[PDB]
């Protein structure tokens, strides 16, 4: 269906020990495909995805310089904000910036994204229409005033509505077999007695792609939403993701339980029983 493109940028102060570190990571949906690190040996933008290794310096060299400009700005912002809030020079600070866009299956622009944060607190948000800034802090109000006056949102619009959309679109084609791929979970169920009377069932759904997954338990045909434990979706470390759930299952009552695993990437859900 639709697809998302995201970029995440972080700058962390490093008093004494050289200059603040700058980290940048790009994603298409769940897949990292580009990286950059100010402490990199190469000091240049690097690909991760096969299907973007065909890009020449006509992108990478300028993008590297752009990320350098981003780093320089973020470093200035960290110092500036310290001033704004009259904070100690001996203190540490972190600034976080992210942006990206959503597109439809036809590559149609859906939504733009841009948000900043400072020391764990929301700074400024830009609406999906990419027209209007929102300040979430004192310093944010100062910055917002500036950004509004210069229509900074317009710069984001040009990219997010255009370059981001076409960039992602092209990537979705070039990496079709790596991005739009599907991988069904290796479903299975195990029984884990707790006491003379108490036991649990574990519903496993490991090694699937993409990360999108829903687990459901039922008993006697009715959903079980109370006596249940679930884990958040986590990387498998092999390009796929893991997830499992469990419920309380008194010994001998296991026959009354059923687990279901639902995906959008699959034509049908999978059912587990014990």
């Amino acid at each position: 269906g639709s697809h998302s493109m995201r970029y995440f940028f972080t700058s962390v102060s490093r008093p004494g020990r050289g200059e603040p570190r700058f980290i940048a990571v790009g994603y298409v949906d769940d897949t990292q495909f580009v990286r950059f690190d100010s402490d990199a040996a190469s000091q240049k933008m690097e690909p991760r995805a096969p299907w973007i290794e065909q890009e020449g310096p006509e992108y990478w060299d300028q993008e590297t310089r752009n990320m350098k400009a981003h780093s320089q700005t973020d470093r200035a912002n960290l110092g500036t904000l310290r001033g704004y809030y009259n904070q100690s020079e001996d203190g540490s600070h972190t600034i976080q910036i992210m942006y990206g866009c959503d597109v439809g299956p036809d590559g149609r622009f859906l939504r733009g994204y841009r948000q900043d944060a400072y020391d764990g607190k929301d700074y400024i948000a830009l609406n999906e229409d990419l027209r209007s800034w929102t300040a979430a802090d004192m310093a944010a109000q100062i910055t917002k005033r500036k950004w509004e006056a210069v229509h900074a949102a317009e710069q984001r619009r040009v990219y997010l509505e255009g370059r981001c959309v076409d960039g992602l679109r092209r990537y979705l084609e070039n990496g079709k077999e790596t991005l739009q791929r599907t991988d069904p979970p290796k479903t299975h169920m195990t029984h884990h007695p707790i006491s003379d009377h108490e036991a649990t069932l574990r519903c496993w759904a490991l090694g699937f792609y993409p990360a999108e997954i829903t687990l459901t338990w039922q008993r006697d045909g009715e959903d079980q939403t109370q006596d249940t434990e679930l884990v958040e979706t986590r990387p498998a470390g092999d390009g796929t993701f893991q997830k499992w759930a469990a419920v309380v299952v008194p010994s001998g009552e296991e026959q009354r339980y059923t687990c279901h695993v639902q995906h959008e990437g699959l034509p049908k859900p999978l059912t587990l029983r014990w």
């Binding site: 970029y7 940048a24 790009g26 580009v34 933008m45 992108y59 993008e63 752009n66 990320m67 400009a69 981003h70 700005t73 973020d74 200035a76 912002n77 500036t80 904000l81 704004y84 942006y99 310093a139 100062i142 910055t143 500036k146 950004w147 210069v150 900074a152 710069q155 984001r156 990219y159 997010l160 370059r163 981001c164 076409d166 960039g167």
Partner: peptide, 10 residues
Amino acid sequence: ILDTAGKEEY
């Protein structure tokens, strides 16, 4: 494609 820094100042 990455974006280009513009008025990125606080």
